[PDB]
């Protein structure tokens, strides 16, 4: 009668892979996988065979780690080729009806049906508010007797069709289920505060290929995009600036990175191989900083376009930074300089999955929790 949930992200530097229990009203961690792979760039499937022994390799180690035979899983999905919006759709009684979650499925159901856009499917279907016979807008309809009907208010997002369908015949290539997929536009609202969420909260995800974005207001999501500049070109500066291999400049971005300047130390010193000669050079953590933090600033201002674009300059409910790259010193301070709202570090609070770049994977296992309550 064991019950688990089973998350895998697969990212452009790594596949995650989480195995959750329910526990105290959140999420027990039991296992985790992760493999680094070349398979994935900008966040969709580049060698399909080296991605799918990739996907294997951290369903393996996961189900090592936690010792649960992984048959079923959850997927997330990136925010790329991916469209939010609101729509409603409405289901009719001719007798009194108890409402259950078989409704609110069918309801939802419906609006997938809406969807005539060929390219795109409907992924995520989630409601805002329910109204009953009219007139009686509610939270949960659950166990109320509805006399004429029930309609959903609800938000949408619609992927391109080829990226969910390589994604999970990927997966499952791997000889197991997906039993869901999670768009991670959906999946960040579970790292937000009610507060934030209600204010008008905005999540930046910093990853290697991909950086996304997504803003949440009046504790729903409001919208939603994704950038083509992450850690992968900080470590590309790295490598051209200090005329360093790119392998050396990601190790030197992970030891001695710092994305602001004027916090970074002159004193502390490395020394760095070249790629025209045989010679060595050395540098300072400064050095470094100038072409992080030149970098992240850019990487910043491309947010704030997309938040311009979609006419959500406004965000009261303030910064949340996530990603791998979110382990960089001094992003928080930087994005500080660069806004007059609050900015904090997301990092997960679970033992085993305390790194930012686990925010998805976790954020996903809630996402199905959260679902498979409103289905009940
Ligand atoms: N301690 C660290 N300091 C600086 N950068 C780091 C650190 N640890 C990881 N990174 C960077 O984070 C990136 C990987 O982050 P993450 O795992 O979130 O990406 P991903 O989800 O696999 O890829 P994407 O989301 O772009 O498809 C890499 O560019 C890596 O260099
Ligand atoms: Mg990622």
């Given at each position: 009668?064991?019950?688990?949930?089973?998350?895998?992200?697969?990212?452009?530097?790594?596949?995650?892979?989480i195995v959750g229990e329910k526990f105290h009203?959140?999420?027990?961690?039991?296992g985790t996988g992760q493999t680094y792979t070349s398979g994935i760039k900008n966040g969709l499937i580049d060698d399909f065979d080296i991605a799918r022994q990739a996907i294997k390799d951290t369903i393996k180690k996961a189900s090592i780690a936690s010792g649960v035979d992984i048959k079923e899983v959850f997927l997330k999905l990136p925010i790329i080729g991916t469209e939010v919006y609101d729509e409603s759709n409405e289901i009719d009684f001719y007798e009194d009806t108890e409402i259950n979650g078989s409704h609110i499925e069918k309801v939802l159901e419906g609006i997938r049906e809406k969807n005539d856009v060929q390219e795109t499917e409907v992924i995520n279907v989630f409601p805002?508010?329910?109204?009953?016979?009219?007139?009686?807008?509610?939270?949960?309809?659950?166990?109320?007797?509805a006399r004429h009907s029930l309609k959903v208010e609800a938000g949408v997002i619609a992927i391109q069709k080829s990226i969910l369908i390589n994604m999970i015949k990927c997966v499952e290539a791997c000889g197991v289920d997906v039993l869901d997929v999670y768009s991670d536009a959906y999946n960040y609202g579970s790292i937000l505060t009610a507060t934030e969420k209600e204010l008008g909260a905005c999540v930046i995800d910093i990853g290697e290929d991909v950086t996304?974005?997504?803003?949440?207001?009046?504790?729903?999501?409001?919208?939603?995009?994704?950038?083509?500049?992450?850690?992968?070109?900080?470590?590309?500066?790295?490598?051209?600036?200090?005329?360093?291999s790119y392998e050396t400049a990601e190790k030197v971005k992970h030891q001695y990175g710092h994305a602001f300047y004027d916090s970074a130390s002159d004193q502390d010193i490395f020394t760095?191989?070249?790629?025209?000669?045989?010679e060595t050079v050395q540098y300072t953590q400064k050095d470094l900083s100038d072409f992080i933090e030149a970098r992240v600033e850019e990487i910043f201002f491309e947010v704030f376009d997309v938040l311009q674009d979609l006419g959500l300059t406004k965000v009261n409910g303030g910064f949340i930074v996530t990603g791998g790259s979110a382990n960089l010193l001094g992003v928080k301070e930087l994005l500080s300089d660069?806004?007059?709202?609050?900015?904090?570090?997301?990092?997960?609070?679970q033992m085993?999955?305390?790194?930012?770049?686990?925010?998805?994977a976790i954020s996903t296992i809630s996402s199905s929790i959260a679902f498979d309550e409103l289905l009940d």
């Open positions: 009668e064991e019950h688990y949930y089973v998350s895998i992200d697969i990212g452009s530097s790594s596949v995650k892979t009203n959140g999420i027990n961690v039991i805002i508010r329910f109204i009953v016979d009219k007139e009686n807008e509610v939270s949960d309809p659950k166990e109320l007797i996304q974005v997504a803003f949440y207001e009046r504790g729903e999501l409001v919208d939603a995009d994704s950038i083509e500049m992450a850690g992968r070109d900080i470590t590309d500066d790295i490598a051209q600036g200090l005329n360093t760095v191989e070249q790629v025209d000669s045989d660069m806004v007059s709202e609050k900015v904090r570090i997301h990092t997960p609070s085993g999955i305390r790194k930012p770049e686990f925010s998805s």
